[PDB]
Structures are given as C-alpha cells and as structure tokens.
C-alpha cells in the first residue's frame, strides 16, 4: 500500500517515459492519491491532498513547475468540489472525472501545434532557448507540414539543455546551428522570430524558466523582433514576483563566500530569472493565442475568491 | 430557392470591389444574412448554426482582406449560440440556471464527464431582432465617440490625421466644433496615390466648417511631427492584439514617428470593426494594390519593378487608446470585448476541422 | 494664454453661500471649512470624514410634515453635497460612497417609523466603512506584508492613506528591519504627518524633499510604495502631484513601484494626458513684505499649482488590492467583476 | 474576513468514529433549529461556567 509522497509513487513513473514532464507527473500522482485513498469523508481527503502537495513541494523546491501542477490540482479539486453533489456522488463523480487530465493534458501538446504552426511562416530563422519540449512539439508538426524555415539554438549554461535540441531536430532534418548563449546580441539583428518556453507564468505574464530568458527578451525588445513563448495550460502558477529575482535557490543570487579547496564555481549566480510582461508579446496555450493581459485575466479570475 | 442566387451575387459583388470600406460591406452582408434567415429550413438549431456557418466560410474564403463581412456573421453566430445555453440549463430540473455572465475560460472544459420551453420558431425571430439591433448599433457608432473623446482631447492642441477616408473622424471633428467650442487645427497627410482624392475632400469638408486646417504631404510629416501634439486614426478593422488594419496608407510610419516622439496615438473604431482573429502572418492581412497609379509611364521593356500598398498595419505598441462606442480601452484590453461579443468556436470558422 | 490652462473651470472659486433655502447642518459647515481652508486630508480621510458626518446628518433627521423619508432624503443630502462641491472637488472615494448611499436610500420602503431608519442606515453605513474601507485595508496589510523582506528601504510619497499602517505593521508588529524614506512637496507638507507618526512609533524615518530626489535613489533603495487617489480605467494612476516624477525615476533606475489601493477607489472614467481633468488649488499658497506680493496688478505673471497628475501604467510594477495583486493594465477586469458586485 | 471568529449553528453530516477529521454543515439548518440549539448552547455555557471555577479552584480533575 503506497503512500504517494516522494518516490513510492511519484518518481517511479518518471523513469517510465522521458516524454512526460514534471507538472503533469504531479497531476497524475495527485489524482492517483485520492483515486485509491478515499476514506468516505470530505474532511480528511482535502487534508491528505494538501499535506501531499506541501510535502511534494518540500521535496524539490527549485522546480516551480511542480508548484504550478500541485496548485492547479487544488483548483481542480475545488471546482470539482463545486457543483455541490453532497459528496454522495462526488466520491465517485470526482474520481470518474479523475483521469480526464491524463487523457487531456497528455494530448495537449499537439493541440499546441494545431494553433501554433500558423506562426512560423516561410523562411523564418528561429531562435529557441532551452529544452522546452512544447516548442519542439510545435516545430515537429511545423516540419511535418513541409514549411521552410531555419533554427538557431542557444546554450543553456549551466543547465546543459541547449545541447539537446541540436541532437533532437537535426535528425528530424532541419538546418540548425548551435549558437553560444552570449552571442545573442550579434545575431538577433538577423533572427526573424524568437521562441522560448516557460516553467511558469506569473499574474501578469512572466517567464520563470531558465538562466537568461530576461537577457534574450531584452535583446528581442532592442532588436524589435517578436518574442513569443510556447507553453501549455498546466503552467499557471500563483507566484507573482516584482523584481527580476524570484524565490532563492538556497541563498541570494550574489554570493560572496570563499571557495574552500576546489568546489564548483559556475553555478554561483542565479539560475531562474524573470521576464516582465512588456518583453513577451504573445503566448501560446491550449486556450488559443493569448496576449499577456489575457493571461493576466485568466490567472486573475481562477485565483481570487 | 431564390436565396442561393443572392448569396453568390453578393459574393461576386464583393470580389470585384463593387463594395468597399467597412460600413457598406457590413450593412450589405447583414442584409444578405437577413435574406438568408428569412428562408432557412433547419429543423434543429445545431443544423442552423451549420447552415449559417458554411455561408460564412464561403464568404470569408471569397475575400479575406475585408473583415466587416467576416465578423458580423461571427457576431450573430455568437448571439445565436448564447441562447442555447440559457434555454438548456433552465430546462433541466436539477440545477436550473446559474445566470452568471463571466466564467473562467480555462477550467470548465477540463472537467467534462461527457411554458415557453422550446418554441421552435423563436430562433428565427431572435435572429431577426439581432439583425435589427445590429443595424441600430452600426448606424450610430459616433455617439459614444463624441461623448467620451472630448474627455480625452484638450483645446489648444494642433492635430494630425493620416486617415482622411473615415466618416467617424469626420463626424467627430465636425461635432467637436459644432456643439463644443474647442478650437484647434488638423494637419492631414495624403496617402498618395490613394487618399489624394480623399484628403483634399477631407480638407474641403473641414474648411466648410472652417477649423484652421492645413494639408501636409507625406514626406513633410516628420518635420512637423515635433510641433503636433496628437495623432488620430480612423481604422478599418482591429484584431485581438489591438493591431489594427487601417485605410489606404501612411499610418504604418507616421504612427511610428508618433511613438518615437512619445506623441499619443488615438484610434476611433466602431464595435463592428472588431475581429476575434489574430494577425498570424501580417502580410496576409494586408492588401497590396496595383502598380498602375504610382508611375503612369507603363515601362514596356526596361520595366522597373515596383510595389504599391493599400493597407498599413500598426502594432499595438505604437498605438495608445481605443475610442469605441462602449468606452475607452487599452490596446491590451481588446481581447475581452471580443470574447464579450464572440465565442471560442467561430474563430476557425470552417466545417473541415483539421 | 498660450495654453490657456489656468482658465479650466473644473474648480469654481466662488465662496460664501448665504442662502437659507435649506437646513444646512452646522457640522457639515465645520467639515467644509475644515477641508477647504486648511487641508488636513488625503482621500480616504476625506471618505471617512464625509461618511461619519453623513452619519450625524442622518442621525439628526428632522423630517418635514407630509413628505415620506424615502422622498426627501436624497435631495436634502444632495444639497448637503453641494457645499462640499463648493469647498473642494470630490474624490472617487467621495463619489463611489455617495452613489452607493443613494442606491441604499432607494431600496428603503415607505413603512419605516423613523426609528428603524437608524438601524438600517447608521448600522449599514458603519458596515460600509467597515467592509469597503477598514477590513479591506486590513487585507491590504495582510497581502502586502509578504512582499517586503527584512532590512530594506521604502520610498513613499506625500501622506499615505493606507500604507502608514503597513509601515507600522512591518516595523513593529512583525519586527523586521525597515528604513522608510518619506518625501513630499510644496505646499501641502503632508509627508511630515507620516514622518511624525512613524518616527514617534520608532522606525528609521529619513525625510527628504522632492527637489533632492536624485540622491535618495543613489543609496541602497528598492520598493517604492505609492498611495493612490484613484486608478483610472486604463491603468493610469491618479494621486497627489509629484508622484509621477519619482515613479518614472524609480522605473528608470530599475527598482520596483507598488500602489496600495482598494477596490472602492477604481474609477470608470478614462484619460491619458495629465493636464486634462484636474484641480487648481488656491495660488496664494505658493508665496509663504513677502517674497512677491500681487501676481495680480502685475501684467504678464501667473502662479499655477497642480494637485493631481498621472503616472503612465508602464511605470507601476504592481497595483495591490484586497482581492490580490494585479498588473495595472488589468484594472478593468476588477472594474467589471468585483466593483459594485462585492 | 468579517465572519471569522464569530460563532453560529451547524448540523453534522458525517463523522469518522476513530478520526477527529469530521465534517459540518449549515446550509441544511432550519430557522427554528438555530434558536433551539442557540438556547441549548446558552444553557450549556451557563452550566459550564458554574463548574469551571469550582474544579479549577478546588483543584480536582
């Protein structure tokens, strides 16, 4: 009898497929929590799932996609707790709704492409940043559409993700180079469109993914090239920062301590930046193309009370 | 019947530029849809949305670069879609009707498990009264403009306008002198070779009501951009970004010179000019015209190639406010008016769901 | 006469209404002479003062002979409004209280014996001052206190309205370290009213002036807070003048700007230019044989002052209200979903 | 915010016999039952206050 906390349920099926990502894995674990542990009373169910979400955030704090999944699960159990079935059917009604995310959010990524293929037009040199697999889910259907384009992939120092794209869509058959991440300003005068992928959307439209998407965003603004971001609808999160600095990793982004003998010195600054709403200009979700004030309204309506 | 000849004679009228602008094509396609709904045989309302939607698909496929004939049909599809839900919830005994206008548009599609009761003919009469109040909305769009834009303009400010060919700016700039007594002047550029038969008529109509006017040419607008405090745009269609599609020319650059001098940019617009689409590829929503009237040499063999443009797009960044008949709105708050008058379904208005 | 802005008739400087047509309450004459002569107020102090003097003027009914209480009180109270209209032009905390008050007058029924009129107007306007003002401000404190780290600074402006209690709460009731910088302006030295209270409570206040605004921002500085008089339909702020210069300087030197506001204070109207809808305020105050006497009788001289001007919404990082944080471009969704309906 | 701390009446839907994690309900409360249980609880408080100081000043369990 599993306890669903850390790895007795969650981290097992992350090794089943390296295509499922973190937040829908969190959705799958949280629905299979109360799919079995349903002790016929509406009180301790919500206590169990709130305890489970807080210990799962307590497992890995610096992967804020997890917070997005573990909080839209609370929105799911709140709205499915609504319609007021007196808990007599909801013990069966909520769990038969249940797996509609793993039948729904799993097949959201081609629904992204079905509305985002009509962005990359003919002969567009494209800049992507980091292994954001929804961007590749758009680009796969774009190359299957037989449309002519070129791609440029940045480095993802120190998180290594930029080396994956050049070994991902090269074998699909797209002419692609791998620029280094510092060389954006000398090339973004030539890049037609730039895509990124978020690990979170704030309450105004923000990109909380990686090391330097604020840098490539402010390069996109002072080259006046359109800065799109491909995401999907399990990436909304309540966390609305105000600076370019989020929750810390373990200390401040500006360390000034002493290296003892030979410890690592690359990851000493920040690793997850923030982008304001001005630098993004259109984001892609399951809900269509979505201007950032629309994503602000969409995350302002389902989070108030 | 005698309705299938009418819908293609209106198609062939809208192909070959016999109707133009944004007012006239909207009134004509609305007249055509009233002729259609007066002779419809649906037997169920979900058949009627298909019978009104394939017509819209054929008519949008006929001529995509005029949007007033493509959004009135979406708007009446929305207002006929709305009364499905109202009737349906009420009929069910168990939960009746919530009757709440605003809903979160993400999540309710992510939990799906699957008297005057029907009165089958009422969809016909409610579509006819929707036709009638669409007429009674489009025919008087200037009232909200002349109500709220005087709150947004002040007195001793010289103005610029790059769209002379709009009746909205003409009626507003006449009624700003007729009732109110705010004196000013209006610089006006000509969109050569298109608005040069209109900008001079625009200056004539403003000199009849004698508001201090003067005509600038296109090349002499940057020198006079430092003097002018405000521009104003009488647009043709405006998208969910606020990136509008204008009249003849000029406005893709003079609005940029307005943005670079931090000069405010207005945009008056009727509510029928909206579109729940998106500028996917911006050149596809831009009507490049003919090369006849920009050099009348007609070079036979030397044949220097050339480019004309009868549509200038502005992005939402260059534009500042939208004066509509339902209030003033940000360029980043044009989506919600669209979803207040359209739905998620009729933006990919096509039977072949690919 | 080149811009002719000094002849803007949005304020009328006529005084001394001697007409005895109506029973003007002596307390409301005290309130108007307390507002217009020596300005001791912000916006929600004007709202609480107006609300708790309308409290007294409904407690002193004095109904006429043949007229029902549902058919006299709105005209009587509108003539009470007219003296404040003469005194100082109204806030949106004036207007969104008085139109709510008239709507609650409207739903009374002609059966009250003028004894339960207290129990459904006094208690209900006390519930208004509770709900739409005070516990809303308590939600402002409990929402904005999580967005201040310890050992930081705050640059307010003028007299705050709600966030004086925020600075006192984060100073004393949560004991985290904080260094408030208060800056104000000629002629209504109302930042000194914050400085006296905050330093009397014992927090590191460092007063300044807006002419020296550069050297504040060259220190260790972040988290500019701003009290609001109203927030327009676009996102344009509207507050005491001189706000927007430190707003654009604060956004220029890439440190965040916040606005502590509540949902009573959002407005339906719309403007984008600063000197369009505005208040001229008594140009004799900008003198204190003086330095100059008589801008009048000298041809070609004028003295102007402005109370209200607009920060553009590119500058405000975060408007905070009692429902939650929000970008300033998204204020019409709380104009339409929550104001009035709550 | 205005309602927290203040007390009211509530009927009980379901109860775990071995867990304190138990539900309450006040939509399904009639108007008479409010006054009846309020009188019963005022009765309860005025028979608790007469034994609280007795046990805590005579110092017994």
Kindly determine whether residue D2 and residue C139, on different chains, have CB atoms separated by under 8 Å: no
Query: Rounded to the nearest 5°, which phi and psi values hold at C223?
Result: 60, 65
**C124, C139, C154 - which closes a domain:** C139
C115 & C189 share domain = no
In angstroms, the Cα distances linking C58 to C28, C33, C77 are 12, 20, 9
Neighbours of chain B (3+ CB pairs under 8 A): A, C
Which residues face C14 on adjacent strands?
none
Kindly determine whether residue A304 and residue C329, on different chains, have CB atoms separated by under 8 Å: no
Q: Indicate which of D21, D24, D25 best probes the interface with A, i.e. most A CBs within 10 Å of its own CB.
A: D21
Please name the member of B151, B156, B330 whose beta carbon is closest to the beta carbon of C4. Answer: B156
Instruction: Give the pairing type, strands C318-321 and C237-240.
Output: unpaired
Q: Does residue C219 sit at the D interface (CB-CB below 8 Å)?
A: no
Kindly determine whether residue C276 and residue B154, on different chains, have CB atoms separated by under 8 Å: yes
List Cβ neighbours of C120 (8 Å cut-off, separation of 6 or more): C108, C112
CA separation for the pair A131, A205 (Å, rounded): 20
In angstroms, the Cα distances linking B16 to B11, B70, B72 are 9, 17, 21
CA separation for the pair A174, A146 (Å, rounded): 11
- Looking at chain C, which residue has its C-alpha nearest residue B229? C273
- The verdict on residue B160 lying in a domain is yes
Core vs surface per residue B169-178: b (16+ CB within 10 A) or e: bbbbbbbbbe
Chain C residues with beta carbon closer than 8 angstroms to that of A301: 333, 337
Residue A162 near residue A178 (C-beta atoms within 8 A): yes
Structure-determination technique: cryo-EM
Q: What is the CATH number of the domain that holds B52?
A: 1.20.120.420
* Tokens linked to C208: 């300044």
Residue C153 near residue C180 (C-beta atoms within 8 A): yes
Kindly determine whether residue D2 and residue C130, on different chains, have CB atoms separated by under 8 Å: yes
Domain count, chain B: 2
CA dihedral B289, B293, B297, B302 (to 10 degrees): -20
C118 & C156 share domain = no
User: How many residues make up chain B in this entry?
Assistant: 354
- Count CB pairs under 8 A between chains A and C: 42
List Cβ neighbours of C304 (8 Å cut-off, separation of 6 or more): C5, C6, C280, C283
Q: Does residue D50 sit at the C interface (CB-CB below 8 Å)?
A: no
Q: Indicate which of B153, B330, B335 best probes the interface with C, i.e. most C CBs within 10 Å of its own CB.
A: B330
CA separation for the pair A105, A234 (Å, rounded): 8
Kindly determine whether residue B107 and residue A75, on different chains, have CB atoms separated by under 8 Å: yes
C186 & C326 share domain = yes
Quick check: bond before A268 cis, omega within 30?
no
Q: How many CA atoms lie within 13 A of C276 on its CB side?
A: 17
Which helix (H) or strand (E) element contains residue C291?
none
Q: Does residue D2 sit at the C interface (CB-CB below 8 Å)?
A: yes
Chain A residues with beta carbon closer than 8 angstroms to that of B335: 291, 293-294
Kindly determine whether residue B333 and residue C277, on different chains, have CB atoms separated by under 8 Å: no
Radius of gyration of chain B, Cα coordinates, nearest whole angstrom: 23
Domain span including residue C318 = 140-342
To the nearest whole Å, the CA of B156 is away from the closest chain C CA by 6
* Physical contact, B and D (3 or more Cβ pairs within 8 A): no
Neighbours of chain A (3+ CB pairs under 8 A): B, C, D
B320 & B186 share domain = yes
Chain D residues with beta carbon closer than 8 angstroms to that of A41: 14-16, 19, 21-23
Domain span including residue B31 = 3-139
To the nearest whole Å, the CA of C9 is away from the closest chain D CA by 43
* Tokens linked to B29: 């396609």
- Looking at chain D, which residue has its C-alpha nearest residue A48? D21
Residue B221 near residue B160 (C-beta atoms within 8 A): yes
Q: Does residue D16 sit at the A interface (CB-CB below 8 Å)?
A: yes
* Physical contact, C and B (3 or more Cβ pairs within 8 A): yes
B155 & B203 share domain = yes
B170 & B212 share domain = yes
CA separation for the pair C77, C57 (Å, rounded): 9
Chain C residues with beta carbon closer than 8 angstroms to that of A243: 222, 256
B228 & B277 share domain = yes
CA separation for the pair C122, B9 (Å, rounded): 69
* Tokens linked to B33: 């849809």
Domain count, chain C: 2
CA separation for the pair C328, B333 (Å, rounded): 11
**C122, C139, C156 - which closes a domain:** C139
- The verdict on residue B346 lying in a domain is no
- The verdict on residue B32 lying in a domain is yes
C153 & C102 share domain = no
Residue A255 near residue A263 (C-beta atoms within 8 A): no
B162 & B104 share domain = no
A56-85 residues touching B, CB cutoff 8 A? 75-76, 79-80, 83
C112 & C212 share domain = no
B212 & B264 share domain = yes
Nearest to B214, CA basis, from B252, B257, B160, B168:
B160
Which helix (H) or strand (E) element contains residue B295?
none
In angstroms, the Cα distances linking B145 to A69, B137, B149, B177, C121 are 45, 13, 6, 14, 39
Please name the member of C325, C334, C338 whose beta carbon is closest to the beta carbon of A203. Answer: C325
C120 & C173 share domain = no
CA separation for the pair B351, C4 (Å, rounded): 61
Nearest to C269, CA basis, from C320, C241, C310:
C310
CA separation for the pair C310, C274 (Å, rounded): 5
Q: Indicate which of A38, A39, A40, A44 best probes the interface with D, i.e. most D CBs within 10 Å of its own CB.
A: A44
Which residues face C239 on adjacent strands?
C309
To the nearest whole Å, the CA of D2 is away from the closest chain C CA by 8
- The verdict on residue B345 lying in a domain is no
- Looking at chain D, which residue has its C-alpha nearest residue A42? D23
CA separation for the pair B245, B237 (Å, rounded): 5
Kindly determine whether residue D19 and residue A44, on different chains, have CB atoms separated by under 8 Å: yes
**C139, C173, C199 - which closes a domain:** C139
Kindly determine whether residue D1 and residue C135, on different chains, have CB atoms separated by under 8 Å: yes
CA separation for the pair B158, C237 (Å, rounded): 26
C96 & C82 share domain = yes
Nearest to A241, CA basis, from A283, A206, A196:
A206
C256 & C308 share domain = yes
Judged by DSSP in three states, B4 sits in helix
CA separation for the pair A216, A155 (Å, rounded): 12
Residue C233 near residue B327 (C-beta atoms within 8 A): yes
Burial of residue B127 (number of CB atoms within 10 Å: 0-12, 13-18, 19+): buried
Kindly determine whether residue C234 and residue B154, on different chains, have CB atoms separated by under 8 Å: no
C171 & C284 share domain = yes
Segments in B236-285 forming alpha helices (H): 251-260
Nearest to C272, CA basis, from C322, C248, C237:
C237
B257 & B319 share domain = yes
B149 & B272 share domain = yes
C120-159 residues touching D, CB cutoff 8 A? 130-131, 135, 138-139
| Number of CB atoms found within 10 A of residue C195's CB | 21
Radius of gyration of chain C, Cα coordinates, nearest whole angstrom: 22
Chain B residues with beta carbon closer than 8 angstroms to that of C329: 330, 332-333
Superfamily of domain A106-302: Translation initiation factor eif-2b; domain 2 (3.40.50.10470)
Residue B78 near residue B342 (C-beta atoms within 8 A): yes
| Number of CB atoms found within 10 A of residue A22's CB | 19
- Count CB pairs under 8 A between chains A and D: 24
Kindly determine whether residue C330 and residue A293, on different chains, have CB atoms separated by under 8 Å: yes
CA separation for the pair A7, C123 (Å, rounded): 57
Q: Does residue D21 sit at the A interface (CB-CB below 8 Å)?
A: yes
Strand locations in B173-320 (E): 185-188, 214-215, 230-234, 237-238, 244-245, 265-268
To the nearest whole Å, the CA of A294 is away from the closest chain B CA by 7
Residue A221 near residue A279 (C-beta atoms within 8 A): yes
Kindly determine whether residue C138 and residue D2, on different chains, have CB atoms separated by under 8 Å: no
- Count CB pairs under 8 A between chains C and D: 6
Neighbours of chain C (3+ CB pairs under 8 A): A, B, D
B134 & B146 share domain = no
Residues of B with a Cβ under 8 Å from any C Cβ are 102, 148, 151-152, 154-156, 264, 320-321, 327-330, 332-333, 336
């Amino acid at each position: 009898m599993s306890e669903f906390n850390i790895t007795e349920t969650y981290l097992r099926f992350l090794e089943e497929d390296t295509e499922m990502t973190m937040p829908i894995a969190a959705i799958e674990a949280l629905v299979t929590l109360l799919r079995i542990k349903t002790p016929e009373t509406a009180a301790e169910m919500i206590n169990t799932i709130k305890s489970s979400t807080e210990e799962l955030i307590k497992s890995i704090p610096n992967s804020v996609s997890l917070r997005a999944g573990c909080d839209i699960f609370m929105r799911f159990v709140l709205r499915n707790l609504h319609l007021y079935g007196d808990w007599e059917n909801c013990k069966q009604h909520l769990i038969e709704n249940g797996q509609l995310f793993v039948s729904r959010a799993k097949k959201s990524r081609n629904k992204i492409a079905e509305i985002g293929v009509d962005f990359i037009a003919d002969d567009d040199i494209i800049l992507v940043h980091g292994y954001s697999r929804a961007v590749f889910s758009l680009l796969n259907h774009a190359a299957n559409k037989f449309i002519r384009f070129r791609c440029v992939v940045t480095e993802s120092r120190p998180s290594k993700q930029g080396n994956q794209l050049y070994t991902l869509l090269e074998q699909k058959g797209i002419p692609v180079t791998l620029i280094v991440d510092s060389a954006v300003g000398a090339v973004i005068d030539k890049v037609d469109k730039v895509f990124v992928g978020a690990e979170g959307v704030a309450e105004s439209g923000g990109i909380i993914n990686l090391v330097g998407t604020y840098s490539v965003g402010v390069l996109a603004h002072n080259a006046r090239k359109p800065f799109y971001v491909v995401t999907e609808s399990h990436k909304f999160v309540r966390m609305f920062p105000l600076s370019s600095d989020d929750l810390p990793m373990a200390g401040p982004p500006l360390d000034f301590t002493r290296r003892t003998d030979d410890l690592e010195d690359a990851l000493r600054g920040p690793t997850i930046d923030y982008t304001a709403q001005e630098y993004i200009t259109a984001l892609i979700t399951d809900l269509g193309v979505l201007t950032p004030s629309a994503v602000s309204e969409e995350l302002i309506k389902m989070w108030y009370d | 019947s005698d309705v299938n000849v009418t819908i293609d004679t209106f198609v062939a009228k809208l192909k070959r530029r016999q109707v133009q602008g944004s007012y006239a094509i909207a009134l004509e396609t609305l007249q055509l849809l009233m002729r259609f709904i007066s002779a419809a045989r649906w037997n169920h309302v979900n058949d009627l949305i298909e019978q009104i939607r394939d017509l819209g698909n054929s008519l949008e496929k006929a001529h995509p670069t005029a949007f007033s004939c493509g959004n009135v049909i979406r708007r009446i599809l929305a207002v006929l879609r709305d009364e499905v839900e109202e009737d349906t919830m009420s009929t069910t005994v168990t939960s009746t009707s919530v009757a709440e206008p605003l809903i979160s548009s993400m999540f309710n599609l992510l939990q799906k498990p699957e008297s005057s009761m029907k009165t089958k003919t009422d969809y016909r009469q409610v579509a006819i009264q929707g036709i009638k109040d669409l007429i009674d909305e489009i025919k008087n769009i200037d009232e909200g403009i002349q109500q709220i834009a005087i709150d947004l303009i002040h007195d001793h400010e010289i103005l610029l306008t790059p769209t002379p060919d709009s009746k909205t700016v003409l009626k507003f700039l006449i009624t700003a002198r007729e009732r109110s007594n705010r004196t000013f002047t209006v610089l006006v550029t000509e969109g050569f070779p298109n608005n040069t038969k209109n900008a001079h008529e625009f200056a004539k109509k403003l000199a009849q009501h004698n508001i201090e006017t003067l005509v600038v040419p296109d090349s002499a607008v940057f020198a006079l951009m430092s003097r002018v405090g405000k521009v104003i745009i009488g647009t043709k269609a405006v998208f969910v970004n606020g990136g509008t599609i204008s009249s003849n020319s000029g406005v893709s650059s003079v609005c940029e010179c307005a943005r670079e001098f931090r000069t405010p940019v207005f945009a008056v617009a009727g509510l029928y000019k909206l579109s729940p689409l998106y500028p996917f590829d911006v050149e596809k929503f831009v009507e490049f015209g003919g090369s006849q009237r920009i050099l009348p040499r007609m070079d036979p063999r030397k044949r220097l190639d050339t480019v004309n443009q009868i549509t200038d797009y502005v992005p939402p960044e260059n534009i500042d406010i939208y004066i509509t008949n339902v209030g003033g709105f940000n360029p980043s708050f044009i989506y919600r008016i669209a979803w207040d008058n359209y739905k998620q379904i009729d933006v990919h208005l096509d039977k072949n769901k690919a | 006469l080149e811009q002719s802005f000094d002849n803007s008739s949005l304020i009328s400087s006529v005084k001394e209404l001697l007409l005895n047509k109506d029973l003007i309450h002596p307390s409301i004459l005290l309130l108007t002479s307390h507002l217009a002569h020596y300005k001791i107020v912000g916006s929600i102090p004007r709202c609480i003062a107006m609300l708790e003097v309308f409290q007294i003027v409904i407690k002193d009914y004095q109904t006429p002979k043949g007229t029902t209480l549902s058919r006299n009180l709105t005209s009587y109270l509108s003539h009470q409004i007219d003296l404040l209209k003469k005194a100082r032009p109204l806030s949106v905390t004036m207007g969104n209280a008085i139109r709510w008050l008239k709507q609650e007058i409207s739903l009374i029924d002609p059966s009250t014996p003028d004894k339960a009129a207290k129990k459904d107007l006094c208690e209900k306007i006390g519930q208004f001052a509770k709900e739409k003002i005070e516990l809303a401000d308590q939600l402002i404190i409990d929402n904005a206190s999580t967005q201040i780290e310890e050992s930081t600074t705050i640059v307010t402006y003028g007299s705050s309205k709600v966030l004086t209690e925020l600075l006192l709460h984060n100073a004393i009731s949560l004991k985290k370290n904080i260094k408030v910088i208060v800056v104000d302006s000629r002629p209504l030295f109302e930042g000194r009213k914050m400085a006296e209270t905050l330093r009397n409570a014992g927090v590191n206040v460092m007063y300044a002036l807006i002419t020296s605004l550069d050297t504040i921002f060259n220190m260790d500085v972040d988290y500019v807070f701003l009290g609001a008089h109203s927030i327009l339909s676009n996102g344009f702020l509207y507050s005491r003048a001189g706000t927007a210069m430190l707003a654009m300087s604060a956004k220029r030197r890439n440190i965040p700007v916040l606005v502590c506001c509540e949902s009573l204070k959002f407005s339906q109207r719309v403007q984008l230019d600063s000197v369009t809808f505005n208040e001229l305020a008594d140009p004799n105050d900008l003198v204190n044989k003086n330095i100059l006497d008589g801008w009048q009788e000298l041809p070609s001289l004028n003295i102007v002052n402005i109370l209200y001007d607009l920060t553009p919404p590119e500058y405000i990082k975060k408007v905070i209200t009692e429902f939650g944080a929000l970008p300033p471009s998204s204020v019409p969704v709380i104009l339409r979903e929550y104001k009035g309906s709550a | 915010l205005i309602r927290v701390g203040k007390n009211d009446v509530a009927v009980v839907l379901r109860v775990d016999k071995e867990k304190g994690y138990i539900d309450l309900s006040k939509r399904r409360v009639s108007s008479e039952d409010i006054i009846k249980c309020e009188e019963k609880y005022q009765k309860s408080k005025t028979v608790h206050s007469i034994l609280r100081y007795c046990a805590e000043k005579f110092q017994i369990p």
